[PDB]
Amino acid sequence: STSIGKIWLTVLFIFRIMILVVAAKEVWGDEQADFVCNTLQPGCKNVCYDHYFPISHIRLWALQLIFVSTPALLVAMHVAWTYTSSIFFRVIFEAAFMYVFYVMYDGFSMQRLVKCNAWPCPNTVDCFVSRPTEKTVFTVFMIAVSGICILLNVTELSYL
Template sequence: MAMSPEMFQELETMTCLLSGASQLTSRIGRVSLAAFFFVRFGILAVGARSIWMEEEKSFICNSSQLLCAPSCFDEFSPISSFNLFALQLVVLITHALSVTCWNRSTNQAAETQLQAYLRGRKVQVVLHILCLLSRVVIEGIFIFTYYEMSGGFLHPAVTKCHTQLCEKNVICTDLNSFSKNVFSLGLCAVSVLSILICLMEVVISPLHRHPPK
């Protein structure tokens, strides 16, 4: 049974929404980016219940001071990696909504002068490339932020606390460091793969396949 034009357009809109890529992106690229969206959401959902729900309780220090452990935890993890990657997902969803709204506005039957201009092949390709590059920038910013925040891609299991609320030579241990590293590295890997796909789409963009005359 042939797919109606309306159903096909809704399917295209859905893939754009989940992938955050324009309709000029190849279907393989859009499907891959959409799949990565579900992978991110799944990792965050599982990690929220199993690792990050009570992560401060798994941070143990050899100190008798009441406020020492919370202060050391804030020093050790000023921003939870869960919060960072959850914010990344929100930013990517916002980016995808913007791309989807642009796609719908340039496919309306009744066109304004601006919409008619945006329908131009060359302009569409330029905006398509800008969407991909903005996605690359977003992914790169969050990878870099995670790296700087963690002092590397791996959280240390044992750290020395330097806060003034503790006595000298206080050592703290994060019991969930291995699980956090696995989940965080998984999210970083998804970001890297998304960057590679976006860069590949830029290289094989319609601007290179069909140069405007």
């Protein structure tokens, strides 16, 4: 009847791990040498990439998995009331990274072209990103599992 969510959290936990490590260092790994900017100006590349990518998706997520897994290893070793507390933390972190995500990345749709008007860059330049479609797809999966994990976590935290 209740606490099926424990299962679903384990399922989605392992799921998220596998979604990352498989596509982890085989999608975004090449996202420094594949940022073709249409200029001879040295440095404009690194500037624009730092501009539109303060953090790469995979790092944010990996952190999110840690901060959301930390209450598990927290509640495991407590002694040799706390349940609901660790679970509430498990809500708010998740929600936080989702927020930060949408703020840094207007929506869940990578734009093929990105303009750029930083300093080394003389004027508005046109820099191209790698495989925006596919990254968008993986975003949709991980935000989806995020929303699920939230909703379950909220419901079973509402057990009264």
